Design a protein around this ligand. Structure first.
Ligand SMILES: [O]C(=O)[C][C][C]OC1=[C][C]=C(C2345B678B9%10%11B6%12%13B96%14B%109%15B%1172B932B437B%1285B%1363C%14%1527C2=[C][C]=C(C([O])(C(F)(F)F)C(F)(F)F)[C]=[C]2)[C]=[C]1
Lengths: 237, 10
């Protein structure tokens, strides 16, 4: 049974997503232009920096997140940011040409664009496999926002001080997701769907690891760090 | 050591 509290949780997360994800992509005017020699780094840095701000606005609205200490909210956001950003990018991803289509040809990003920001196939090959496997789950919007929230409130992140309380908030979301799939997701789409969504969180841990490896390599060159944003530098180190 | 995150979370 989907309890009143569980229906409440889903309504809040749906609204939180709608308030932090603009599918018209109107704010892309503010970013430095794409040029298609890490030519795409300024635009894609600006894209990530904006996405970080939106992920924080979403996180503050997760029920229970703001009962954590400041240090624990910060630990959870720094360690989850690139994972949530990859999850939230799935909305624009298209399997027609394996690209992120943000409403315009100028703002349509393929593997060649990502390599033009300094990243290699060690990241991009698994990233595309991930985007494809997630897209094939055909998540309900309700499932998509629960997954983003569960990703953020993870108790095994390093530096987490009050892991017992992080685990308590995450379990409320996981039981909400598990019960939602049983009551509202018709078969055969629902077959092993929760286990498949948890596997995507595992895939995201490996993608996180490789991202930071490549981030440390490119950001160790000051000529590249000059093209990043202050917020990207605070979050990714 | 994280002023902008702290301000955004406030
Ligand atoms: O609308 C709204 O909201 C938004 C829209 C919508 O979503 C969205 C989000 C995101 C995206 C995305 B995809 B590709 B994948 B890759 B690219 B693109 B970007 B990210 B994901 B990842 C990426 C990146 C990483 C990292 C980097 C780095 O690393 C950093 F630093 F930044 F981090 C460099 F360095 F490279 F830059 C960069 C980039 C898209 C989409």
């Amino acid at each position: 049974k989907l309890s009143e509290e569980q229906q409440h949780i889903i309504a809040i997360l749906l609204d939180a997503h709608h308030k932090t994800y603009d599918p018209t992509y109107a704010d892309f005017r503010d970013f430095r232009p794409p040029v298609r020699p890490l030519s795409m780094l300024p635009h894609l840095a600006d894209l990530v920096s904006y996405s970080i701000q939106k992920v924080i606005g979403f996180a503050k609205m997760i029920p229970g997140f703001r009962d954590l200490t400041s240090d624990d909210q910060i630990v959870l956001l720094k360690s989850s940011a690139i994972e949530v950003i990859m999850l939230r990018s799935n909305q624009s991803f298209t399997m027609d040409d394996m690209s992120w289509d943000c409403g315009s040809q100028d703002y349509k990003y393929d593997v060649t664009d990502v390599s033009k920001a300094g990243h290699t196939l060690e990241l991009i090959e698994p990233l595309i496999k991930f985007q494809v496997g997630l897209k094939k789950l055909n998540l309900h919007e309700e499932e998509h926002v629960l997954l983003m929230a569960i990703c953020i409130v993870s108790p095994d992140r390093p530096g987490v001080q009050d892991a017992k309380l992080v685990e308590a908030i995450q379990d409320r979301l996981s039981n909400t997701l598990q019960t939602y799939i049983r009551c509202r997701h018709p078969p055969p789409g629902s077959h092993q769907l929760y286990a498949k969504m948890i596997q995507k969180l595992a895939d995201l841990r490996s993608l996180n690891e490789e991202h930071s490896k490549q981030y440390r390599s490119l950001s160790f060159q000051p000529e590249n760090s000059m093209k990043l944003t202050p917020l990207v530098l605070e979050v990714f180190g | 050591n994280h002023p902008m995150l702290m301000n955004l979370l406030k």
